[PDB]
């Protein structure tokens, strides 16, 4: 995808993440765990439902039209009736093919983007207290217990509290 996260610096997806589309796994002094990220998951779901609802909205209603099957050879007028219909069908078939190609390219890119946005947001919270290991994981350079991990996950992590400890570990 365009952002290089999904099938990129994130090496693979997690079959064990069964309660969200995007999320976190951690290891700290209290063990390991996993949690779905609700906001990123819902942003992707909401965009996908948005495009689905635009696509499946409003079939056209048509009533009396032209005949499209014929039991006798007639020549010129029938030739034209059949050509008009064949022309119409080929144009709609082209629209249908192109629509799903464009939509699908974009769905892959928007989901890749949501992964990348979560990663960047997490990085920004951590400031100088962590480093990007290059595989979608952050090495956090301070003791970070379950409540600390949850503070990152819920967006209230206070980098200043841990900065002295982390810098000592990173740089000295």
């Amino acid at each position, epitope marked *: 995808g365009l952002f290089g996260a999904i099938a990129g610096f994130i090496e693979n997806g997690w079959e064990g993440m069964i309660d969200g589309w995007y999320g976190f796994r951690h290891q700290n002094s209290e063990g390991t765990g996993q949690a779905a990220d609700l906001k990123s998951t819902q942003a992707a*779901i909401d965009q*996908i*439902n948005g495009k689905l*609802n635009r696509v499946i909205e409003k079939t056209n209603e048509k009533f009396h039209q032209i005949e499209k099957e014929f039991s006798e050879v007639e020549g010129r007028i029938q030739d034209l009736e059949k050509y008009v219909e064949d022309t119409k069908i080929d144009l709609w078939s082209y629209n249908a093919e192109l629509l799903v190609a464009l939509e699908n390219q974009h769905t892959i890119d928007l989901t890749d983007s949501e992964m990348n946005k979560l990663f960047e947001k997490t990085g920004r919270q951590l400031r100088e207290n962590a480093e990007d290991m290059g595989n979608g994981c952050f090495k956090i350079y301070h003791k970070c217990d379950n409540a600390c991990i949850e503070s990152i996950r819920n967006g209230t992590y206070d980098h200043d509290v841990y900065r002295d400890e982390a810098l000592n570990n990173r740089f000295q």
Partner: antibody
Amino acid sequence: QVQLVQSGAEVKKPGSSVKVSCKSSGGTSNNYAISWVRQAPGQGLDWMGGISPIFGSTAYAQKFQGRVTISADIFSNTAYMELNSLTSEDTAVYFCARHGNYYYYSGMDVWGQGTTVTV
Amino acid sequence: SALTQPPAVSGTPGQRVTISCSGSDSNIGRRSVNWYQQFPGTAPKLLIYSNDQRPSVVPDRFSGSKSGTSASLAISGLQSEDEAEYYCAAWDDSLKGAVFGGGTQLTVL
């Protein structure tokens, strides 16, 4: 402002099945989880399960697993609950309710009017 | 069950009333609590979510809190229109499903 509108009251004989619908009007609910919650006469609320149809999740309460089928039609903006092998223990009002987001943890903030099923 | 509430609470107009909700580690302990209000024959209404968060349409006299494996709904300044059934709720990680308390009937004296 979305409203959830449920199908009408049902009278059922023992062993039969009932399928209740929940239509999201005034907007779609396809990007949210909708749960089904029942309330037996004089009793409390009881979760049956839910569905989040774009996300692709259907969940069931263990106590109803195998007897209930929850489904959705994203094109008509409708969710469904089908409960099989009915007995008098299933006489209850059945509600559909939409969660604040795509999954079942969030508070249920939009509720249907309820559907009475009498067995 | 799973969550346990007193069957009944009462108060006078203007009084402060509290409704307790006892759970376990698999629900209230590790998950967020929601509270619902229900008038007879009508659908429940969301009153509190995420433990202490209040929807904009819900009066500020309603508040919620969570400590340990317990939760509490407080109604400051009780009004007559608050006579209703109240339910606590949370996800349970052991049952892998949503659970509710048995409900508390609030009577305005």
